[PDB]
Amino acid sequence: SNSQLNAMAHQIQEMFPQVPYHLVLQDLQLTRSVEITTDNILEGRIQVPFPT
């Protein structure tokens, strides 16, 4: 029942394809605000696991 949260993360994935979609989905549970989630990414709230 988190279709809205999933959809919201889509816009962020579009703006910031550098970050993991699912980790964004998580922040959308945290803040439920893509405006925050995006700044959250920038704060280091959402870490980006590089290819390893």
Curated annotation (Swiss-Prot):
Signal sequence region: none
Superkingdom: Eukaryota
Compartments, as annotated in UniProt: Endoplasmic reticulum membrane
Tissue expression remark: Widely expressed.
Residue span, CUE domain: 4-46
Post-translational modification: Palmitoylation of the RING-type zing finger by ZDHHC6 promotes localization to the peripheral endoplasmic reticulum.
Recorded disease: Spastic paraplegia 89, autosomal recessive: A form of spastic paraplegia, a neurodegenerative disorder characterized by a slow, gradual, progressive weakness and spasticity of the lower limbs. Rate of progression and the severity of symptoms are quite variable. Initial symptoms may include difficulty with balance, weakness and stiffness in the legs, muscle spasms, and dragging the toes when walking. In some forms of the disorder, bladder symptoms (such as incontinence) may appear, or weakness and stiffness may spread to other parts of the body.
Function: E3 ubiquitin-protein ligase that mediates the polyubiquitination of lysine and cysteine residues on target proteins, such as CD3D, CYP3A4, CFTR, INSIG1, SOAT2/ACAT2 and APOB for proteasomal degradation. Component of a VCP/p97-AMFR/gp78 complex that participates in the final step of endoplasmic reticulum-associated degradation (ERAD). The VCP/p97-AMFR/gp78 complex is involved in the sterol-accelerated ERAD degradation of HMGCR through binding to the HMGCR-INSIG1 complex at the ER membrane.
Free-text domain note: The CUE domain is required for recognition of misfolded proteins such as mutant CFTR.
Assembly mode: Interacts with RNF5. Also forms an ERAD complex containing VCP/p97, NGLY1; PSMC1; SAKS1 and RAD23B required for coupling retrotranslocation, ubiquitination and deglycosylation. Interacts with DERL1. Interacts (through a region distinct from the RING finger) with UBE2G2/UBC7. Component of the VCP/p97-AMFR/gp78 complex that enhances VCP/p97 binding to polyubiquitinated proteins for their degradation by the endoplasmic reticulum-associated degradation (ERAD) pathway. Interacts (via the VIM) with VCP/p97. (Microbial infection) Interacts with Staphylococcus aureus HIgB; this interaction regulates AMFR-mediated inflammation by promoting TAB3 ubiquitination to promote TAB3-TAK1 complex formation.
Protein name: E3 ubiquitin-protein ligase AMFR
UniProt organism field: Homo sapiens
